[PDB]
Design a protein around this ligand. Structure first.
Ligand SMILES: *[C@@H]1[C@@H](O)[C@H](CO)[C@@H](O[C@H]2O[C@H](CO)[C@@H](O)[C@H](O)[C@H]2O)[C@H](O)[C@H]1O
Ligand SMILES: [Ca+2]
Ligand SMILES: [Cl-]
Length: 496
C-alpha cells in the first residue's frame, strides 16, 4: 500500500481538482504523459448531494448519496474511458474515497443528487447502496449532540458525526463489504490507489479490515500482485491524542505539518527562515519519509477549510508559491502531490473568505471545459499550476534526480540556501531582501546548464539563465531579490 505504482521515473501526482473525466483523459494524453507526471488525484467519482444553497459548492462532493460513478465530472463510461486512456499513456488515477460518512444528517430527503438517486438522511435511508439506520453510528456515539465535540476524546472523533455528516458503522462487515464493493469496482476499472478521506475519523483497524477486502491492481496494466497505493488523510498538527502513526500499517498518511511549516518558513513568520531547512524532514517532527504524502497546499486548506492555517501558500501567492513548490520538488522527503486549482472570487471580510464555498467554473451548474491557450496556460478560470513552467520543470527535476542523496547544502544563516541531489541536480534559493551572488559547489559534471525556472532547454540552447559549472563542480549563481522567480534549478537533462 506504500508504493505509488507510477511508472519508473515518474515521481509526482497532480490533483486535478473538480476536473471532468473527459478533460483529464485529454490532459493525460496531451500533457501529463509527455511531461513526466506520475498520476492524477481525481475528485470523488461517486454520486453526491446536489446542493443549491449555496449554488453547487465544491464541498457537496464530500456528501455521498451512493457509489454510482455519476457526478458533475461525468458518468461511469466517461470515468472508465479516462482511466483506460490515462493508463495507456502510463499516467495513473488515484480516487478520493469518501468512505467515513454519507451526507449531512439535516439534508432534505428526495432526489437532489448527481445521478437522481433517492435518499432520506433523516431516516438513514440510502437505497441506492443500500444503507439503512442499522449502518450508521447513531447508537455508538456518546456525545450529547451526536456530532464530534472534543478532539481530545479519540473515541468520539471516530464514532460521532463530523459536522453532522452521517457516520458509517465501519465495524460492520456489511458496511465494510459495501465500501470494498465500490473500491474493487474502481480497482478493476484500472485505478492505481486511493486517498482515504477523513481517515482520522475512522479507526485504523476498520480501515485495515476494508483494505483486506481489496483486489490487487488490474493485471492488464500492472504486474501481478500489485497493491493499491493508499494515502490516508489524517490532519495531525501535533496537539491531539490521535497520531497519524497509528495508521502506518495501512498505507501512507498526508503530512499536513509539511505545508504548514514550509509556509511559515517562506513567509518568514515568527523569525523562521530558509537556513533552518537544512534538516527538513523527520527532524521537524514529520512522519517517516516513506509514509509521507506531501504537498504545499490542498483543496481544503488553500481556501481555509480542513485545518486551514493562515501560513498556507497557494497560487494566489504565486511568486512565493513557486518557490515553496520548487523546494518541495527538489527535496527527497516524501511522495509529492502538486495542486491544480480553479480561480474563484475570493472576498475577505474580517480575515475570512465569504466565497470559500464557490464550486468549479460552471455554466448553470455544468462544469466548464478546460481550454488550453497557445502559451500552454489554461482558460475558463482553471489555474493549471501544474502547467506553470516553474512547476512543471520541477516535476521533471524530481524525476531526473530520483534516488540521489541530499548533499552540498549551503546557507548564509538567513534565507539564501542551496543544495544538490547527488550528481544529478542543484537548486539555489534567495528569499532575503538583498541579492545572492556567490560561487557554490554544485556536485555536477562540468558544462553549461539551462536554468529550468527562468527558461527551458530547447533545440540545444537555453531560453533563460545559463549556469557554467567548472571542472571542480563549482558554479557562480546570481539572484536578485527582485527577480521574477528568486530561485534557479539545473539538472542532468538541462545540460547542453
Ligand atoms: C474530506 C472530507 O472528509 C471532508 C468532510 O466531508 C471534506 O470537507 C468538506 O466537505 C464538508 C461536507 O460537505 C464540508 O462540511 C466541509 O466544510 C468541507 O470542508 C473535505 O474536503 C474532504 O477533504
Ligand atoms: Ca467515523
Ligand atoms: Cl489531502
Amino acid at each position: 500500500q506504500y508504493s505509488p505504482n507510477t511508472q519508473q521515473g515518474r515521481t509526482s501526482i497532480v490533483h486535478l481538482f473538480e476536473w471532468r473525466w473527459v478533460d483529464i483523459a485529454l490532459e493525460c494524453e496531451r500533457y501529463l504523459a509527455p511531461k513526466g507526471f506520475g498520476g492524477v488525484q481525481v475528485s470523488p467519482p461517486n454520486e453526491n448531494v446536489a446542493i443549491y444553497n449555496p449554488f453547487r459548492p465544491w464541498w457537496e462532493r464530500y456528501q455521498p448519496v451512493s457509489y454510482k460513478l455519476c457526478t458533475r465530472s461525468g458518468n461511469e463510461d466517461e470515468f472508465r474511458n479516462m482511466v483506460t486512456r490515462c493508463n495507456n499513456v502510463g499516467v495513473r488515477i488515484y480516487v478520493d474515497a469518501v468512505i467515513n460518512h454519507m451526507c449531512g444528517n439535516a439534508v432534505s430527503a428526495g432526489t437532489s443528487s448527481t445521478c437522481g438517486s433517492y435518499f432520506n438522511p433523516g431516516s438513514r435511508d440510502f437505497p441506492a447502496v443500500p444503507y439503512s439506520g442499522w449502518d450508521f453510528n447513531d447508537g455508538k456515539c456518546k456525545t450529547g449532540s451526536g456530532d464530534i465535540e472534543n478532539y481530545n476524546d479519540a473515541t468520539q472523533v471516530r464514532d460521532c458525526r463530523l459536522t453532522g455528516l452521517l457516520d458509517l458503522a465501519l465495524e460492520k462487515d456489511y458496511v465494510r463489504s459495501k465500501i470494498a464493493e465500490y473500491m474493487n469496482h474502481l480497482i478493476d476499472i484500472g485505478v492505481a490507489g486511493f486517498r482515504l478521506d477523513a481517515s482520522k475519523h475512522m479507526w485504523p483497524g476498520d480501515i485495515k479490515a476494508i483494505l483486506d477486502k481489496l483486489h490487487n491492481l488490474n493485471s492488464n496494466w500492472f504486474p501481478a500482485g500489485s497493491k493499491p497505493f493508499i494515502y490516508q488523510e489524517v490532519i495531525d498538527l501535533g496537539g491531539e491524542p490521535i497520531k497519524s502513526s497509528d495508521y502506518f500499517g495501512n498505507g501512507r498518511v498526508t503530512e499536513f505539518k509539511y505545508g504548514a511549516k514550509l509556509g511559515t518558513v517562506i513567509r518568514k513568520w515568527n523569525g523562521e527562515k530558509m537556513s533552518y531547512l537544512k534538516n527538513w524532514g523527520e527532524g521537524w517532527g514529520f512522519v517517516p519519509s516513506d509514509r509521507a504524502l506531501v504537498f504545499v497546499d490542498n483543496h481544503d486548506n488553500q481556501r481555509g477549510h480542513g485545518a486551514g492555517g493562515a501560513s498556507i501558500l497557494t497560487f494566489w501567492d504565486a511568486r512565493l508559491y513557486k518557490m515553496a513548490v520548487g523546494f518541495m520538488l527538489a527535496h527527497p522527503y516524501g511522495f509529492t502531490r502538486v495542486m491544480s486549482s480553479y480561480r474563484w472570487p475570493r472576498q475577505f471580510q474580517n480575515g475570512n473568505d465569504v466565497n470559500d464555498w464557490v464550486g468549479p467554473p460552471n455554466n448553470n451548474g455544468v462544469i466548464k471545459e478546460v481550454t488550453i491557450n497557445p502559451d500552454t496556460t489554461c482558460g475558463n478560470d482553471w489555474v493549471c499550476e501544474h502547467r506553470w513552467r516553474q512547476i512543471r520543470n520541477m516535476v521533471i527535476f524530481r524525476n531526473v534526480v530520483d534516488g540521489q542523496p541530499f548533499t552540498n547544502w549551503y546557507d548564509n544563516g538567513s534565507n539564501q540556501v542551496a543544495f544538490g541531489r547527488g550528481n544529478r541536480g542543484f537548486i539555489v534559493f534567495n528569499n532575503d531582501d538583498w541579492s545572492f551572488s556567490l560561487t557554490l559547489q554544485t556536485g555536477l559534471p562540468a558544462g553549461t546548464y539551462c536554468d529550468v525556472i527562468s527558461g527551458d532547454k530547447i533545440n540545444g540552447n537555453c531560453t533563460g539563465i545559463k549556469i557554467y559549472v567548472s571542472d571542480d563542480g563549482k558554479a557562480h549563481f546570481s539572484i536578485s531579490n527582485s527577480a521574477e522567480d528568486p530561485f534557479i534549478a539545473i539538472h542532468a537533462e538541462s545540460k547542453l
